[PDB]
Design a protein around this ligand. Structure first.
Ligand SMILES: [K+]
Ligand SMILES: [K+]
Ligand SMILES: [K+]
Ligand SMILES: [K+]
Lengths: 318, 318, 318, 318
């Protein structure tokens, strides 16, 4: 029933010993015993214990011993609070689910998370790749395109004989091999090499890796919706009435196309309902797709907002 | 006019008895009278009352007795504050409407709110269900699909004779009864059986149940807009001039289709305005639909953000 | 240089008189002079002044006298701070622009801001209005529709001779007069009569009135974009080459339609670019419209979020 | 080992000198040595140092000396904390990246960031510019259009002989020069002359200049996606099978159009996939474009929200 005072950074908190012995493995629980005087900073005329720390966030630490639970203040950031919990001996996993997400956001985002003589020929190779398909240079190929191919491969050797014995490379600079030896479908990926110096694409790559669950969620939502609406639209268009000679929806498989074009509010118009039942089903499909897509995408977009703001805050400071 | 001190967790608050008497049914109101000395923790040389609670959130409780009204601090969470209101005797419905929603959101969101031998045949049944509609296996039916149905039903008994006398089951395993006797429109819903173990679909189901009013709102908005613009576009296209043989909008009913395809920014293109008045009306319809849809949808999406974040944080703590 | 202590709700603040005399018309400025001893609550053993108010929010009031400026705390709500500024004598217009909007949000949102025997015939009237346009009951008109018109007009008197001498009535029940004597374009609007009891449409009406500037903004943005892109697409499609017999864009006016259908991501497809220059212009138009629309619409949507949350928090407390 | 008390605005903080000498060039560091008594306000009966500043935000300043790092409180605004760091001698670039953006937002947004006798003829010129393109006034030109042109030019001098010798002027009023001597493609831009007094367009211009990086990001994302998906759709549509006479995608360049019309959810429908491989690729393209666009656009939209709210808070205070 005795009472003990903690003079934290000037601010005097009072409590009972009983409250301190509630979590026995921590630093505070080491003051409740009848010797703590010879183990701490003990003012023996004010009868108190001095600790040189933030007096503001201590009352949220003491609350753990007082009530039963550990929350996070909303007037300090994650790192400040975690530094204080680290000082006091509190396991940072007892944070209640109301406060865990905001408490961890910054750490979850931290997570460790001749160039012009290359870019020119990369762009050259991309363009020549694109124009061999155009039926302007296929009278049936032509030959200046093969010469420009020659030049880009003759340079790809100068910056690739610097790689393996002179030591994105084995999985993207294979066409250099296969040219004399997907043949060019891979050639575009070299654009990634020169743009890995961009602070925005690396933040993108980190976001597409910290959000693999919210991608599975979106894919499963879309698959469920597409199946449901594809099968509804078939039976809805069937009551308009052998065969189906009056409707774009001749089977359920061809309805997956319609459903995915509709749920995204794209709407080409090659497939659309033509009976009133179908029009009702399609009115439903449009809104259902809007909501289905709109639920997990904000979760994926906040991740980018956070990581981008952090990676650009770093790129502005010395 | 006498004054009283409350030493809450070290921090000394002062008031007059008069202020305390303002809410007479609470714990504080029991200190104003001349016997609390022998009913509480009373230091009779500092003349004060010790209470072993968070000293930070008390000044928002005392404010109730001081001014007239009860607000919620924005530096603590909902659960911490509600625990202390519970300690002090305050009815948590006196929270003013400025602070009520932010105070309750976490509690409103809490609300408690052989597998490989089954999934295989579920997928098998789904695909065979999709493929008898395709006019490739209808030279008019075929027979290997009928045997595939046979084997899936011969398995559906091994997981269904386990349920009702061996005791979504009656409303989704009826086709098992129905095949030998909607005939298979219901067959797809078995997909939900194996996917009720997904933490994302259960969060979805909880959000479509905590947001039944914001769905009514959206549907009513859309119906109002669709009717208004459908009747506007008819009269707008009529001044372009026995009949109207120059316009997609031959009646007002056929215009509900146009209006809903337009207000969603889908735009198939089977129906579009062709006179200048019609184009003005359609320009209005597009933006009106954008805003109409965009007002309640963010309310519905915040619910998912909250519930999903909570259910995923729970899946990460021990 | 003398110093004075203000004991607000237990918490002792210290300052110099010099700081107090900085705003001379307020309550604090009345303590600096050498007679306040007999005009307030003055402990003449602590040499201090007691005030029975929130001790936390006072340090943001004192800051005004200390530095020069008035800000709003982010750990209390608008109304609490407003009541304290009202108590201390501070003109609530001195709030710096960093804190003004967050300070006023709740007050800007407050701003004070037989049924089945009516709804039935309203719905009946709406339908019969919709189906005289359909060329199924126009072999030209028909007669059961005229009888249904008769019966709803015979009822509209029983709820309209209840209004003017027995005393949305004048500007919605003109068709009553106008039937026997726009004739029905207005007949639709009676739907609003029965839906004025809806908590969602009233919040809509309040939001469509508290955001009349953010509507002018959107309209002006769209007008500028439509004009610029309509004139750009004409000249862009003209280099594809006595007339223009190869392009949807024969003049600049007809391009306003294209531009508004494109900037909304609707895309019917009746007009699209067909030369490479046009495709570049259209690629620009799509994204420019996306961004133009997406800038003011979130401002308009937050207003609805706020007003709806308030109107539903009110409908949940007694 | 000695301890020192700082009495900031009433609130007494304690620390050791050891902590104070951690940052040796600041104001606090000037108290650690044994002469500061004669350089500050030193009560030699409580042995303490009085400073007349906000006692609340000091504990976040003192934390810098205590732990190692500088954070920003979330209960005060940017400018308040900035003024306090300025008072105490702290370099405001030591703010850790968790708190830097929230600290700077208001300053990043501050950054200093006859009318009817003109507007009439501006609108007149715009209209005239629009209708000589229309093939109703081209029997091929006409002459009342040239007379209206003449009148608006012979007014253009009364506001343009007032500007350069009586001294957006050279780069918008060159058409006046070139009329008698792009001839009018520039003629539309005069609309900006009269609308540069609009509070919304100036805020628009400020966000379009404070967000030039998030535009580069969007453009690069879109270019990457367009190239990748245009290459994929060609090869995907090729396996549907002496030429390509069955598909809209005859070469890779013409697929850039498809990809940009699809990634924006516009979907004209002049180009769409027709084989199942193509349909899979297009299903991917739609969602990929949605996400690609939706990542940086919210960053661009928050800037407008902030700058507009600030410019309207300024336009409402005296
Ligand atoms: K769209
Ligand atoms: K479309
Ligand atoms: K569309
Ligand atoms: K379309």
């Amino acid at each position: 029933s005795e009472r003990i005072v903690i003079n934290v950074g000037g601010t005097r908190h009072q409590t009972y010993r009983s409250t301190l012995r509630t979590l026995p493995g921590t630093r505070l629980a080491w003051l409740a015993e009848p010797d703590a005087h010879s183990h701490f900073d003990y003012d023996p005329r004010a009868d108190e214990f001095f600790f040189d720390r933030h007096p503001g966030v201590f009352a949220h630490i003491l609350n753990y011993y007082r009530t039963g639970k550990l929350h996070c203040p909303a007037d300090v950031c994650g790192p400040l609070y975690e530094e204080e919990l680290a000082f006091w001996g509190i396991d940072e996993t007892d944070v209640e689910p109301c406060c865990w997400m905001t408490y961890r956001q910054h750490r979850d985002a931290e997570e460790a998370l001749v160039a012009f003589a290359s870019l020119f020929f990369i762009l050259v190779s991309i363009t020549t790749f694109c124009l061999e398909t155009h039926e302007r240079f296929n009278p049936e190929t032509e030959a200046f395109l093969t010469y420009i191919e020659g030049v880009c491969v003759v340079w790809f050797t100068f910056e690739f004989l610097m790689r393996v014995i002179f030591c994105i490379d084995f999985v993207a600079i294979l066409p250099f091999y296969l040219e004399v030896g997907v043949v060019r479908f891979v050639r575009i990926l070299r654009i990634f090499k020169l743009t890995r110096h961009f602070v925005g694409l690396r933040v993108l790559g980190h976001t597409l890796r910290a959000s693999t669950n919210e991608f599975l969620l979106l894919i499963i939502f879309l698959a469920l919706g597409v199946l449901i609406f594809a099968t509804m639209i078939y039976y809805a268009e069937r009551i308009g009435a052998s065969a189906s000679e009056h409707t774009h929806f001749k089977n359920i498989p061809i309805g997956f196309w319609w459903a995915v074009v509709t749920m995204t509010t794209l709407g080409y118009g090659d497939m659309y309902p033509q009976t009133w039942s179908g029009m009702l089903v399609g009115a439903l499909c449009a809104l259902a797709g809007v909501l289905t897509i709109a639920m997990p995408v904000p979760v994926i977009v906040n991740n980018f907002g956070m990581y981008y703001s952090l990676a650009m805050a770093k790129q502005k400071l010395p």
